[PDB]
Design a protein around this ligand. Structure first.
Ligand code: ZN
Ligand code: ZN
Ligand code: ZN
Ligand code: ZN
Ligand code: ZN
Lengths: 575, 280, 62, 386, 237
């Protein structure tokens, strides 16, 4: 009653004490059972959902293995609404199977009485055309997975890849140089559970091995992989990772990003983008012949990088264009606005593994980030106009604050004297110009080029003379930003907790630490606590700096009031 | 365990010692980690010595004579922070200065030379490949810690005399490479101990609070508590076997049959280094 | 010779009080005489309805 | 504080206060850092050492701690000048203290002290004793302003609940002792009885008041001798603003609900959350944020008392930063006067304004002098009479 | 906080010599000076601890851990039981002192050890006495020492390696006044007071065969064993 470190709430919520002697044998149970809500240093909090138990019984633990090991780690006794919910959502897993064979999708069951029940729903009858089967339509495989969860007979996507006898197993082999860390070996152990691959989503940090798990999963299924990325830079990296750890010739890692097109028809690993496979307009002739080839060959283990952009309207039509047995999703930040991540549990599969972010920091795999949110007072000449108008001009007024300018010029100087590499993320591109030419620093404006985007990015890395760089909404993906040490984010997009976990990934790739400039007593204070809403669920502590370490004593700009009055005559002149 | 060492440390003073990719002066990052290296050397080596030579403009100059002063080296490295560093160094001249006065040490020591080398070019007025036949004859073990590249003559110098050769990744790799040289590799001297604060026992030459040798009569003056820390490896203490009331903390040795506890068995063997029942 | 309760505050919050003087959100003659970029003299009967207006502005950034 | 009370006291009672096991050890136990050394140094002396010696017994660094020690050490009248020989009543009785001249006791103490604290919350299981209700209201932590069927709790009573368990008892006895001079007995025998408890006929009546809070245990309805309790000696908090509390006592749960909000309640655990709208709900009555931080550091879990600094620093200034939203717009009352074309008279009025301590704000452009209305009735007399 | 271990030199051969010397300072007029300093350490703070060790010949008994009327009646009855190889042993008592501090430091504190040495030093335990000083230096444990008649050469090195105090008393019956002056304050209050500075350090070593105190000798270069005026060959290995 003092050991057994859980608490099973009656709705469903699992509070786990991460200081018990049996924590390591109770955290390696609740990962396979529940999904993590919050993980501070002392008391974790998991959550029993319906989808989390479908991923449980997909691994070898039965329904009597789970409810007999909740009692031995209870501290309360499981309160009879968790005993019933576990029994309900685990005896109805392996009853309806969606298997494909030679480019035809098939709904298969073994118990025939389920087929006597499944064929009266008025929408399952709209996708048609012991072992009872009926052929389903490929074009609306999305709606079938919606309805099959809607009547608690869910669809599994277990590829049985050891013995299929149709697909030409290629010579992809993992080389003995890519040694994989023990958190990557635990995520792949939940995917390839019983010697059969499983379509899930694996959430590892970007500076962590998010790509090596992708190559190792392609090295294990050993069928025709197909890697998808968000940008044309991201497909230039997956080629560079498959050549590093997988021993493939140059005649099989083809790309499909419309600039080189290294014979994309007839290969074994195709690395393309979204909005290439789901380009809804009239295609070019070279692209029309490859999409005619890609639409008629069954794959195995699609890899969908940047999974959080799949539930959009265009990017989710990809999964019905291309036929694949297994579908792995690798991301770094699963959160997203508009509540469409619960949508993703049937487009791809259940959530397989989530990396403990404070555990990878404590073992040295991720840089120890000192989060800080320094907030700046408002200038009295600028607050005169901020409360006068409400119609969108006040977004310029809190990002071009003169007292916020003094906190960026001081933080740049404070780390240039420590030989740190600074990245100043700043949206609202008018504020990018008037910040990066008053300090004479390079800036990736966004409509620059492909050429000078590269040369600014590489003199930043291998040269100790150029120290800062002012990006603008470009580094909000998995780009090749060259290992910053600090990150002074100035007035980014509004209330998105996806973005401020992608800016954090630039820092962890106190060792390194990033800032967040906020003009106080404005709307940006409400925004900056809505964006740390995700990072406090990974244990990150956000300090508050009210006054800096001697800002009034160096040669900071905007000293007088006559040079402060000109900026209000420049910002308010836009309208 | 280890033996006596007479280690020279050769420091480069080339034009390329004003380069970046370190602390913003390449020489002052070398001199920063060297002052840490002298302090850590004399603590794992009680009766050893350190000489420091520099090279600049095809010439070598002995910055500090070979003496076991753990203070006179640090106050000289702090003096040479503002060196001008003009010209290219030499490796024949530096290993000739470090051989004309390292040949005359007694044969029961481990004479060594550690060359910290930043430049790529060793412009020297003679051939190097007869020094390496001479250094191998004089049993000198030359090891080089290089910067930014791998010179061919620095691998021939290391692997023929018997030392190592390594190249820096960063400043964290540079501090890790110097800590491998503080450990000693696996005759009777005449010292005089220093009772009475710090005096001299041979000629009453009073000087400051140092373990340095006598400047007048030439006798090494060491502190006997410093040599006492390097005991307990010879005739060390054995482990115990285990199967209430204790003997050390009062709340099992097989020599004197004295029952210990778990908090005492971790303390006698690790920090106390002597059995508290065996002293009776 | 006028009578009025004093208010000292942040200069950023001071311009909020000058904004309510020339916008008639509460009354007409709210500020009797501005004296300083840190201190503002207001009338006495509308202090509590002013305190809830600042508390509204402090609660639009939760 | 204890030495705050004994500093404002006459020497006519301190000499009879010094009993042998009780008082001389208690005042010696509370002496700041160095006063404990000087008493032990001249404890065995008989001839007075010269006055210039104790100034030279300390270094030049930390010389400021010398005078604040002896300012208290002479403030309690332990030595005097004598020309620094100690008091003969103090030196004799302290030398007696250097050898001169049962779970039922604990569980009763916690459940009897908890019902005293339950009187300060809304509960039908209150401490029904009419002598204690009038005891608290004259102390100033139970507002009535009426006869009242319940007694209310003022702003000072909210601060009493979050004080420490020894520290709230010393504030409670100091209001017992300050009023007992005219309703009870002498101050000397009751104060020396508490210190003798730490290690006449009217004194039995004081014992029955300690029977109500719980510091003695009778067990047989006023027998000869008593039984002292453990009261007579003198939870985790996370980065995401959650605090888990392993208590089940109903008093300790409602003390969290003053500055948090409840969202589950298991047996043997209660999880709450420190939010913005709940700390400011407590500060609006005034339980101010220096008391919230001291509430959680004295009641912390053993797993919090580890190598990290307790009460991790993100949550210890966010509670401080939520206090400062009330700190904006500090109102203060004043009266103005202006509209004079004389360029000396506004400067002439400064010589008649600052010496009363009534001026609030000073200006240098137009020179607005503001006076409080308590001091406005006499500054209007000076302006009309030159 | 502030645990103070007193190691008294309870050598029954030296104390019996002064008991018949009629020097008006016996053992019973010295253990009570430890008992007063034992009682006076338990007054300067609420949470202060105590431990007294007595150095007999071939034995070293803990005295106090077996309010002050139960803390002084134990030390009285234990001297009445212990006092009822002509050189005392001190390093066996400081070895139990570092063992008791290490256990009480596991149940949580700055500690210190006060040695009241009376007899002359025994050079035959120098190899063991120097080990318990470096074991005390690595845990910041001060080793204070007051000596009665003769300067112990081993004990002066204990107070300068660890960082304690060394004080030779000139007078026997005024022992308590020195103990209450320089050894009653703890480590933090020691920086704010004037104490007598150390006057002399006795730095010598011992031969590995004769264990004589040598000022000029011969060390080995690999064994670091200091030898007397022979130097033929390394005797150990
Ligand atoms: Zn000499
Ligand atoms: Zn033990
Ligand atoms: Zn033994
Ligand atoms: Zn040897
Ligand atoms: Zn000898």
């Amino acid at each position: 009653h003092t050991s057994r470190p859980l608490w099973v709430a009656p709705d469903g919520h699992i509070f786990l004490e991460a200081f018990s002697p049996v924590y390591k044998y109770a955290q390696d149970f609740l990962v396979a059972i529940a999904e993590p809500v919050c993980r501070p240093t002392h008391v974790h909090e998991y959550k029993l959902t319906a989808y989390s138990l479908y991923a449980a019984v997909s691994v070898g633990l039965q329904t009597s293995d789970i409810t007999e090991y909740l009692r031995k780690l209870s501290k309360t006794g499981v309160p009879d609404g968790i005993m019933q919910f576990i029994k309900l959502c685990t005896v109805s897993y392996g009853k309806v199977k969606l298997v494909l064979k030679h480019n035809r999708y098939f709904v298969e069951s073994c118990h025939p009485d389920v087929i006597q029940h499944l064929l009266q729903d008025p929408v399952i009858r709209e996708c048609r055309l012991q072992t009872v089967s009926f052929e389903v339509k490929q074009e609306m495989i999305e709606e079938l997975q919606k309805r099959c969860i809607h009547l608690e007979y869910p669809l599994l996507a277990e590829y049985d890849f050891r013995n299929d006898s149709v697909n030409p197993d290629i010579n992809i082999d993992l080389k003995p140089t890519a040694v994989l860390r023990p958190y990557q070996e635990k995520s792949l152990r939940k995917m390839f559970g019983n010697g059969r691959a499983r379509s899930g989503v694996i959430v590892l940090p970007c500076g962590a091995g998010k790509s090596l798990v992708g190559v190792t999963a392609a090295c294990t299924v050993r069928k025709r992989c197909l890697v998808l990325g968000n940008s044309a830079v991201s497909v230039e990296q997956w080629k560079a990772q498959f050549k590093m750890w997988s021993t493939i010739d140059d005649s099989q890692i083809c790309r499909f990003t419309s600039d080189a097109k290294d014979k994309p028809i007839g290969c074994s690993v195709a690395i393309s983008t979204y909005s290439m496979l789901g380009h809804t307009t009239k295609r070019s002739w070279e692209a029309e012949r490859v999409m005619e080839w890609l639409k008629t060959q069954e794959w195995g283990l699609m890899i969908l990088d940047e999974v959080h952009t799949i539930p959009a309207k265009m990017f989710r039509r990809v999964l019905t264009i291309v036929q694949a047995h297994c579908k792995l999703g690798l991301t770094a930040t699963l959160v997203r606005e508009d509540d469409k991540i619960v949508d993703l549990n049937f487009l791809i599969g259940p959530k397989l593994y989530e990396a403990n972010w404070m555990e990878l920091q404590n073992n040295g795999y991720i840089a120890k980030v000192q989060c800080a949110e320094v907030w700046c007072p408002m200038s009295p000449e600028f607050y005169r106009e901020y409360v006068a108008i409400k119609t969108k001009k006040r977004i310029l007024l809190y990002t071009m604050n003169p007292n916020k300018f003094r906190a960026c010029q001081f933080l740049i100087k404070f780390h240039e004297r420590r030989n740190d590499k600074i990245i100043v993320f700043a949206d609202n591109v008018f504020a990018l110009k008037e910040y990066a030419i008053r300090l004479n620093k390079p800036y990736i404006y966004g409509p620059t080029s492909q050429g000078e985007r590269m040369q600014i990015l590489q003199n930043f890395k291998h040269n100790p003379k150029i120290n800062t760089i002012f990006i603008s909404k470009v580094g909000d993906t998995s780009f090749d930003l060259p290992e910053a040490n600090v990150l002074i984010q100035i007035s980014s997009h509004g209330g998105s907790r996806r973005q401020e976990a992608q800016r954090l990934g630039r820092v962890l790739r106190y060792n390194a630490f990033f800032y967040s400039l906020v003009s106080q007593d404005t709307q940006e204070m409400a925004y900056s606590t809505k964006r740390q809403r995700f990072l406090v669920d990974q244990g990150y502590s956000f300090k508050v700096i009210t006054k800096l370490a001697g800002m009034e004593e160096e040669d900071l700009a905007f000293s007088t009031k006559e040079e402060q009055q000109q900026l209000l005559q420049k910002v308010l002149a836009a309208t | 365990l280890g033996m006596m060492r007479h280690l020279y440390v050769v420091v480069d003073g080339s034009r390329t010692m004003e380069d970046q990719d370190l602390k913003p002066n390449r020489l002052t990052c070398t001199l920063k980690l060297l002052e840490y290296f002298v302090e850590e050397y004399f603590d794992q080596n009680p009766i050893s010595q350190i000489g420091i030579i520099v090279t600049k403009s095809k010439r070598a100059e002995k910055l500090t004579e070979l003496s076991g002063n753990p203070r006179k080296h640090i106050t000289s490295l702090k003096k040479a922070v503002d060196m001008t560093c003009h010209g290219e160094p030499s490796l024949y001249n530096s290993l000739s200065i470090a051989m004309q006065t390292l040949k005359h040490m007694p044969g029961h020591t481990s004479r060594e030379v550690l060359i910290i080398f930043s430049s790529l070019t060793t412009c020297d007025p003679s051939n190097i490949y007869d020094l390496i036949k001479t250094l191998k004859a004089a049993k000198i073990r030359v090891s080089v810690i290089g910067l930014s590249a791998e010179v061919r003559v620095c691998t021939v110098l290391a692997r023929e005399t018997g030392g190592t050769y390594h190249v820096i990744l960063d400043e964290s790799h540079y501090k890790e490479l110097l800590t491998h040289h503080v450990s000693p590799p696996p005759g009777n001297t005449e010292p005089g101990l220093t009772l009475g604060g710090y005096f001299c026992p041979q000629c009453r030459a009073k000087y400051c609070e140092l373990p340095v040798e006598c400047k007048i009569c030439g006798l090494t003056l060491v502190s006997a508590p410093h040599l006492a820390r390097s005991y307990h490896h010879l005739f060390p203490l054995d482990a115990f076997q285990e199967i209430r009331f204790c003997y050390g903390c009062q709340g099992v040795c097989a020599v004197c049959q004295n029952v210990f506890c778990v908090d005492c068995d971790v303390f006698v063997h690790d920090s106390l280094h002597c059995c508290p029942g065996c002293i009776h | 010779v006028l009578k009025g309760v004093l208010i000292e505050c942040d200069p950023a919050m001071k311009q909020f009080l000058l904004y309510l003087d020339e916008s008639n959100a509460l009354g007409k003659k709210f500020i009797i005489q501005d004296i300083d970029d840190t201190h503002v003299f207001v009338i006495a009967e509308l202090v509590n309805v002013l305190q809830e207006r600042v508390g509204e502005l402090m609660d639009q950034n939760a | 504080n204890l030495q705050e009370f004994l500093g404002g006291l006459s020497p006519g009672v301190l000499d009879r206060l010094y009993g042998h096991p009780a008082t001389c050890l208690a005042v010696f136990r509370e002496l700041p850092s160095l006063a404990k050394n000087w008493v032990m140094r001249m404890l065995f002396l008989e001839q007075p050492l010269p006055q210039a010696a104790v100034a030279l017994w300390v270094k030049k660094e930390f010389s400021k701690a010398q005078e604040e020690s002896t300012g208290l050490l002479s403030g309690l009248r332990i030595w005097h000048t004598q020309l620094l020989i100690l008091n003969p009543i103090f030196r004799q009785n302290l030398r007696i203290a250097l050898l001169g001249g049962v779970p039922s006791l604990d569980k009763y103490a916690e459940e009897r002290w908890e019902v005293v604290l339950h009187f300060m919350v809304g509960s039908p299981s209150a401490a029904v004793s009419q002598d204690l209700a009038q005891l608290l209201s004259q102390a100033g932590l139970m507002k009535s302003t009426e006869p009242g069927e319940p007694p209310c709790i003022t702003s000072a009573g909210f601060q009493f609940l979050l004080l420490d368990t020894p520290a709230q008892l010393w504030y409670f006895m100091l209001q017992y002792l300050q009023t007992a001079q005219s309703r009870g007995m002498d101050l000397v025998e009751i104060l020396s009885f508490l210190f003798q408890l730490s290690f006449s006929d009217s004194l039995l009546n004081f014992l029955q008041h300690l029977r109500e809070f719980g510091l003695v245990f009778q067990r047989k309805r006023k027998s000869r001798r008593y039984y002292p309790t453990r009261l007579a000696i003198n939870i985790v908090v996370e980065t995401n603003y959650r605090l888990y509390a392993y208590t089940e006592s109903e008093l300790q749960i409602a003390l969290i609900a003053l500055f948090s909000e409840m969202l589950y309640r298991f047996p043997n655990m209660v999880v709450a959350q420190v939010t913005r709208e709940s700390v400011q709900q407590a500060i609006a009555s005034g339980i101010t944020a220096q008391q919230i931080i001291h509430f959680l550091r004295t009641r912390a879990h053993p797993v919090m008392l580890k190598q990290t600094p307790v009460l991790p620093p993100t949550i210890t200034d966010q509670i401080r930063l939520w206090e400062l939203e009330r700190d904006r717009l500090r109102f203060t009352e004043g009266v103005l006067y202006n509209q004079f074309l004389s360029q000396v008279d506004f400067e002439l009025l400064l010589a008649h304004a600052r010496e009363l301590g009534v001026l609030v704000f000073e200006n240098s452009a137009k020179r607005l002098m503001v006076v409080t209305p308590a001091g406005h009735s006499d500054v209007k007399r000076f302006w009309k009479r030159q | 906080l502030n645990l103070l271990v007193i190691v008294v030199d309870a050598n029954p051969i030296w104390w019996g010599k002064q008991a018949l010397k009629e020097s008006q300072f016996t053992l019973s007029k010295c253990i009570d000076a430890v008992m007063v300093l034992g009682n006076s350490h338990l007054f300067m703070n609420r949470s202060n601890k105590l431990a007294v060790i007595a150095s007999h010949i071939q034995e070293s008994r803990f005295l106090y851990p077996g309010l002050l009327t139960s803390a002084n009646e134990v030390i009285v009855e234990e001297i009445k039981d212990l006092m009822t190889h002509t050189e005392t042993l001190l390093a066996g008592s400081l070895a139990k002192a570092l063992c008791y501090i290490h256990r009480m430091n596991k149940e949580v504190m700055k500690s210190r050890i006060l040695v009241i040495k009376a007899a002359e030093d025994s050079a035959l335990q120098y190899m063991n006495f120097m080990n318990v000083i470096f074991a005390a230096q690595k845990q910041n444990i001060l080793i204070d020492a007051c000596v009665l008649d003769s300067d112990s050469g081993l004990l002066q090195q204990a107070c300068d390696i660890t960082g304690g105090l060394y004080l030779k008393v000139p007078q026997m019956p005024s022992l308590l006044q020195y103990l209450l002056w320089v050894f009653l304050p703890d480590q933090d209050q020691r920086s704010q007071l004037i104490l007598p500075p150390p006057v002399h350090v006795d730095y010598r070593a011992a031969c590995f065969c004769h264990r004589n105190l040598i000022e000029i000798g011969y060390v080995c270069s690999v064994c670091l064993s200091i030898f007397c005026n022979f130097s033929p060959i390394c005797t150990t290995c």
